[PDB]
Amino acid sequence: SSDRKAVLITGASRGIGRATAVLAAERGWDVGINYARDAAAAELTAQAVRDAGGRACIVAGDVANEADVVAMFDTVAAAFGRLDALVNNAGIVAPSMPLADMPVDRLRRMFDTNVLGAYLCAREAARRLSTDRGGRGGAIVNVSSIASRLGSPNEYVDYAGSKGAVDSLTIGLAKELGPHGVRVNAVRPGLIETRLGAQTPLGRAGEAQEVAEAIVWLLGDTASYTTGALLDVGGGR
Amino acid sequence: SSDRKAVLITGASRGIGRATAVLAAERGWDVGINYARDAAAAELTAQAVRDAGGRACIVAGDVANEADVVAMFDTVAAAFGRLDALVNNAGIVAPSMPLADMPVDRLRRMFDTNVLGAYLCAREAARRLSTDRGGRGGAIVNVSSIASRLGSPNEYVDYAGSKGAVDSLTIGLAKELGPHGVRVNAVRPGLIETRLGAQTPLGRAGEAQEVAEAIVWLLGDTASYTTGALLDVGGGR
Amino acid sequence: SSDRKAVLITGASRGIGRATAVLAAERGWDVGINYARDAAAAELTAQAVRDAGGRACIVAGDVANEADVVAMFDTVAAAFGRLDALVNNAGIVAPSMPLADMPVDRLRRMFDTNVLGAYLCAREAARRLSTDRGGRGGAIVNVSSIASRLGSPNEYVDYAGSKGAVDSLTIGLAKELGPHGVRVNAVRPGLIETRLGAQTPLGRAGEAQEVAEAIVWLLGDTASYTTGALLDVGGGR
Amino acid sequence: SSDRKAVLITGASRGIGRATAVLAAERGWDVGINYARDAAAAELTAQAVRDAGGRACIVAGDVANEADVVAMFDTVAAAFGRLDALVNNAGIVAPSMPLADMPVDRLRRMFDTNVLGAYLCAREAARRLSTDRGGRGGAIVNVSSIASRLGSPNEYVDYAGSKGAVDSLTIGLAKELGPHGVRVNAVRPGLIETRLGAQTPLGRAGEAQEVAEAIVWLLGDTASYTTGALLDVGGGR
């Protein structure tokens, strides 16, 4: 017996993912903490979840790999006996450069992680949360970026495109899953601390917590008529 | 002495405005309740604010009239000894028709209320909340509509344009006021109860409360890196 | 007898309006040249239309004034015996400043010209071009601005809002008038010559002619499935 | 010796690609016609190019395969002795269904073709057209879809995302390549003939030619200040 809802967060070992995990716990959720390689960081996130009063379940996996994604969801469901939500947050680290200089391996990693991975995880949430497929309803939040509308020229135009895909996914899947009890929204963070931040209207980089607040709001019941939204959290940029 | 912040809400006698007033009170705010003509409804909103634990100040005025707007803000400041926020919500009621059939008096009322009025109130908030003009910082939320992106053809294409102006105001003023301690966001409600609602992905019209939740979130401190956002609350449409 | 189509252009005495008039003439149109005060400049535009092979009809009027707008359209129809199109281009000149400093008279002029005026002219085109109201079909192009998405903070946030209204008008009216043989699109020019221009990706301000090209394309038959579009002409900004 | 510019069009064997090839030829271009499998259809497009007065070069290749993309560009350059433009148009055919039912192989094909392929081809155009990398400048047009903003729920939400990526690519790459003499734009076609078309404001599906007109305009010199644009060609939807 537990009246806490369960959220699976991808890329939850650091940054926005970690803050979201901890905040969701403070707000009454149990949390599946997915990570790719940094298991020690994931365990620190889990301890922070537990300290905040939540159950935590750590789960390794490549979001681009179908078998890993099915196992991730299966694992969280095993642990908590339920699944109520997904936060799509996994990303990659890549160097700043123009498209012309980017090698194909980097492009593939960017799209496989940010596009295919977000689709596979959203697909699994669709299968498991939709009321027409046996689920109890729920919410998905996709983490996008202001890069989707700004383009990250000379830096990460591939990342920019990947988040454009996430924005479009959000709009379409919200429509698709609305009749089946599942809301789908996105946050579009700007510059978030881990000197451009200083050039934004609020005059600073954002804190991961500040993005987490937006995520956890969109996951909760007070957001009940909010689906298909794209919520910029970028300091006015 | 009061640690409650003060928000002036325009068109607060009914609907989204009323729900926002009541919810803001439940969440620790005192509320200036502006109305155009329906004083009895405004007084009912005030009683609901007071019942929720807030101070309420009722204030009549045409948002399109500069003298009324200055008096509205002056009045709330008198009552509470402070101003922390504005919700731009005042609107008009107009019949459904194509642009070709709309009389000029209706067009003028639509734009004077939804465009000029929103600008005059935002201007006053800018004068009074900005840290560079003696204020303590704060937040503005503009109530827009999904009509800004859908166009309300054969119904209210003038209303649609007015909310397009509000979306653009939001973006620009967020940038303009960010360095001066003031966040500016908008909610874009869809169909909100006072049979199209049934054709939205969530399969129903929204409740005013559901929009109020989004407004009050954007007004509060957990939205601290969120400015310039346009937050759809339209059930997936 | 004339196989040339007729376009009424508002604010056609200078800049984008003038270039559009001249280019439309080069491309086979006759042109109504509306102006507010600068009759000498309008006459120079007319001579350029005539030199390019078109008939020209000069017509004074405030687009914000219903009687002037009805007379403008009546006049062009008298001159050419037909009306096929409208370019909504009239604007105002205003100084750069934050909203907080703008006087109410400036705000009113901005909105009356850019919002009410665009609606009254679009309304008249709707009445006269729509096939269900006796017209032969046609096209409307609204001149908006990239300011609608950028916000012109600390400069012209009122102008920004006005063009946000124009973008929304475009979307809605396109839907509304599609079944009645009338396409409606907008161009969103960036910095256009009459040192920010130097900071755009193409590294310069645009020429009025360059915007005129986009306008005249959207007016012509090769744009036959293009309606509701918002066409940025801003050098990548 | 030839004063005709050269454009490489991906997926040029049928539909929008074919119409663009033929129209570009009518308007003074030589054309590289890329195809994946349907060589007979590509040859028919080539004959239509030649009949219109252009040189044609047919070139097989998977846009998702780096070696094929480099060979495609190398081949066109060999044939014509120059490269001036790219139209990114290659796509896949997939059945209509909700995301939950889509198999992973279909998702991969969609993204590899519409996202990775568009990036690899755009990357090659960046390498070859940019003035800072030895090229003579030029233009890229990406073929997107109104699906990027509508989401294609219950049909092709993966395709929708892929075109969201293309829209973001367009914005970013326009900024990135503006200083190096290359414009980058997108067309977003709606329903285009190869009963939803009947429900659009213009009351019909569009013709491939109608999209080709928009593409060829964006490729030409009269579009000289137009870059980063997203040009809807969807009948008002």
Return the structure tokens found at C67. Answer: 């009687």
**Nearest one of A182, A122, A85 to D99, comparing CA atoms:** A122
Count of alpha carbons within 13 angstroms of residue A11, beta-carbon side: 19
Range of the domain at C122: 1-237
List all chains that touch chain A, counting a touch as 3 or more CB pairs closer than 8 Å.
B, D
Please name the residues in contact with A25: beta carbons below 8 A apart, sequence gap of 6 or more.
A31, A48, A49, A50, A52, A53, A54, A56
Q: Which of C35, C119, C156, C159 is catalytic?
A: C159
Integer Cα distance of B130 and C146 in angstroms: 26
Resolution, rounded to a tenth of an Å? 1.9
Chain D CB within 8 Å of residue A67 CB: no
Return the structure tokens found at C12. Answer: 């056609």
Å from A211 to nearest chain B CA?
A: 8
Integer Cα distance of B75 and B57 in angstroms: 8
Chain C CB within 8 Å of residue D172 CB: no
Q: Helix/strand/coil (H, E, C) string of A101-157?
A: HCCHHHHHHHHHHHHHHHHHHHHHHHHHHCHHHCCCCEEEEEECCCHHHHCCCCCCH
Of B203, B206, B214, the CB nearest to A179: B203
Q: What count of other Cβ atoms lies within 10 Å of the Cβ of residue A134?
A: 9
Integer Cα distance of A50 and C10 in angstroms: 66
Chain D CB within 8 Å of residue A119 CB: yes
Q: Chain B residue with minimal CA distance to C148?
A: B168
Please name the residues in contact with C105: beta carbons below 8 A apart, sequence gap of 6 or more.
none
Query: Which residues of A are known catalytic residues?
Result: 159
Integer Cα distance of C55 and C38 in angstroms: 20
**Nearest one of C3, C103, C114 to C64, comparing CA atoms:** C114
Of B126, B157, B228, the CB nearest to C176: B157
Beta strand C29-35 with A85-88: parallel, antiparallel or unpaired?
unpaired
Q: Chain D neighbours among A 120-149 (CB < 8 Å)?
A: 120, 122-123, 126-127, 130, 133, 147-149
Domain total for chain A?
A: 1
Chain B CB within 8 Å of residue A55 CB: no
Integer Cα distance of C146 and B76 in angstroms: 37
Four-residue CA torsion sign, B89, B93, B96, B102: negative
Chain B CB within 8 Å of residue A187 CB: no
Integer Cα distance of A129 and A125 in angstroms: 5
Return the structure tokens found at B208. Answer: 């005013």
Query: C201 vs D210: CB contact, 8 Å cut-off?
Result: no
Residue B136's region, left for phi above 0, alpha for psi from -120 to 50, else beta, is alpha
CA A109 to chain CA centroid, nearest Å: 17
Query: Is A112:A64 a contact under the CB 8 Å cutoff?
Result: yes
Integer Cα distance of B182 and B176 in angstroms: 9
Residue B56's CATH number: 3.40.50.720
**Nearest one of D145, B190, B164, C168 to A178, comparing CA atoms:** B190
Question: Residue D209: what residue type?
Answer: Q
Return the structure tokens found at C173. Answer: 């009216």
Integer Cα distance of B227 and B215 in angstroms: 13
- Give CA separation, C234 vs B106, C197, C231, D107, D178, in Å: 34, 9, 9, 35, 11
Å from A45 to nearest chain B CA?
A: 21
Residue D37 burial by Cβ neighbours in a 10 Å radius (0-12, 13-18, 19+): exposed
Residue D193 burial by Cβ neighbours in a 10 Å radius (0-12, 13-18, 19+): exposed
Å from A79 to nearest chain B CA?
A: 30
Count of alpha carbons within 13 angstroms of residue D87, beta-carbon side: 37
Which strands sit side by side in the sheet containing B5-9, from one edge to the other? B56-60, B29-35, B5-9, B85-88, B138-143, B182-189, B230-233
